[PDB]
Amino acid sequence: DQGCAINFGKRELKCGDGIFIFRDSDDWLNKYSYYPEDPVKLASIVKASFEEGKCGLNSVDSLEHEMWRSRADEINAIFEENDISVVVQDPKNVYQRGTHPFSRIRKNGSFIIDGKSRKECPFSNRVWNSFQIEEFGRVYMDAVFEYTIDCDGSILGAAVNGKKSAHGSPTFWMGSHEVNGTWMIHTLEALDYKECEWPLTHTIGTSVEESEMFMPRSIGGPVSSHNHIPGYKVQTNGPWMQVPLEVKREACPGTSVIIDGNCDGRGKSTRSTTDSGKVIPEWCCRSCTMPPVSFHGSDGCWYPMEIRPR
Amino acid sequence: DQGCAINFGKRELKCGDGIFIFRDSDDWLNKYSYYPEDPVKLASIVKASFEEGKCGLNSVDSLEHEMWRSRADEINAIFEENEVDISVVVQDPKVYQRGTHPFSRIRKNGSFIIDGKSRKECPFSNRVWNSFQIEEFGTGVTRVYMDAVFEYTIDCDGSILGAAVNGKKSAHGSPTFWMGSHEVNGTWMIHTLEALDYKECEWPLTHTIGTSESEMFMPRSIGGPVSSHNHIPGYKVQTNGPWMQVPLEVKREACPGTSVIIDGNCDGRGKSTRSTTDSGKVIPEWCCRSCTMPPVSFHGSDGCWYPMEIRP
């Protein structure tokens, strides 16, 4: 990796060789060309998997969904030639957990790629995480017949430096820093809602319990010391199911939080506006930090589980 | 951090933002100009430590030793001008060991030996080891600034470390250490390891990658990441290894003029032994228990050495 970074805090320019992790993989929104195994073996794989009694798939991330939407037509043409057709519907960005791996090779039935749990096949009868990537990047994919719950490590990244760190992915970016001795989040952009856990071999400083972390493990978020914000426990019932998120350290427009010690807390997150689009600027919280945190997603301003409407 | 990686001939260019670590920290050998706390208060600190019963210091890294060598004279001059019967002399550990005291808080020619042989009068007990912290990492056109600390700590300083992982690639870094792992057919395994000192500060738990103590190649106490990335298959922890040498280079190749054959009959797990004997003659009769086909061999001061699993 022959490159040439430049800092501005410590004022370096140092060039040479090493390891680089770019965020801009979060910005190359559509440049990949996902080529699965081949236009033949994949067809037989899905045909067999349907023939065993798996109604439809369940994408794991936006990359899988894009690949399937682009390559449904080739598989349909192949089957035409050699009684099943794949119809790729749309989840907004809320890829949930399927509970089956692919199956081994040996009316108009359908293999819905990721559809609503319409009482005809629940999430139980779906294949979720049964691909793995061989080339970093055009990306080639290979099928797998073993169930897994950890995300694919071939596309992840992590890095630490002097008082700086960053957990990356093409659809995720968390950036921590150390101030006054401790490590705490300061950037967080999520473009999906995955449910694959972060692998241990790509976490930095795995020496924590799952009770101080900000982003929970199941939603997919590194299990480390860098992943937590002081004064806030795990965000189980957070606003994680939304479209592109951003965790921000500022009170949401028109509202205010006054640090108290008498108002109940630790329930579920609540939007700043009511169901009729009216703000409620009467927010309290228990012992929290001086500024509040607030997500910025699909509906807009949400608040963490420690900030309640008084 | 707006930098990028370039491919020659292919003439691609991918710039942006992120985190960048470079090996070349093990290439830039002499540009640092270390500045201590200040010319005046460091003198008072070492004077107070001497008054409380600490014979001398003990450097931990090459950076501290070079700083002391460069800046002993200023402290000597300040001491002279303040009329005090002390003077610091700095010797030369070729191998930095462990003291047991932090700097003491401020409130015939005595000797405050920086790092010299344990001459049965100033043992390691009366020595200060790890009492500094880099605050700013300089500007350059680098000038590392150091601030005292009065609490004993056995971890190294994180302001100069760095770790990174990517698709099937990893690297733990320092200006005096570079381990680089990769993932081939399953697990992770070292493929490059260059050490320039013999430190004894443990790697910090917050700058490791995959912290999930009997398979690690480089031991913990010598100072080496506690991670799954830190091991070589078939070779267990290197307690009595050849770590005490000047720049090492863990190489995966047979040693010159020798030969290794895997055997299920010979002894193992002893101590590291050099390829050439005490008289400069090789011994090409090397055996190994369960090991791997390409043997590993530390290349240090005297040349070839061998791990603890390979015996003559």
Numbering used by the authors:
A (entry chain a): 1 to 82, 85 to 108, 129 to 159, 166 to 338
B (entry chain A): 1 to 94, 96 to 108, 129 to 162, 165 to 235, 238 to 337
Copied sentences from the primary study:
The cryoEM structure of the YFV sNS1 tetramer is determined at a global resolution of 3.57 Å and is further improved to 3.31 Å by focusing the refinement on one of the dimers. The local resolution map shows that one of the dimers is blurry with a worse resolution, indicating its flexibility. Then, we performed focused refinement by applying a mask on one of the dimers and improved the resolution to 3.31 Å. The atomic models of the YFV_NS1_tetramer and focused refined dimer were built according to the density map. The chains were named AaBb and Aa for NS1 tetramer and dimer, respectively. Generally, all flavivirus NS1 dimers have a cross shape, formed by the intertwining of Monomer A and a, showing two distinct surfaces. The β-roll domain, the greasy finger (loopβ8–β9), and loopβ5–β6 in the wing periphery region form the ‘inner’ hydrophobic face, while the wing domain and β-ladder form the outer surface. In addition, we also use the Alpha fold to generate the 3D model of the YFV NS1 dimer. The structural comparison showed that the RMSD of the two dimers structures is 0.847 Å, suggesting the modelled dimer structure is very similar to that of the YFV_NS1 dimer.
As the multifunctional protein within the Flaviviridae family, Non-structural protein 1 (NS1) is considered as a promising target against flaviviruses. Moreover, the sNS1 lipoprotein is involved in virion production, immune evasion, and multiple aspects of pathogenesis. The NS1 monomer has 352 amino acids, forms 2 α-helices and 20 β-strands, and contains 12 conserved cysteine residues that form 6 intramolecular disulfide bonds. The NS1 monomer consists of three distinct domains: a β-roll domain (residues 1–29, β1–2), a wing domain (residues 38–151, β4–7 and α1–2), and a β-ladder domain (residues 181–352, β10–20). β3, β8, and β9 are from a ‘‘connector’’ domain (residues 30–37 and 152–180) and connect the wing to the β-roll and β-ladder domains.
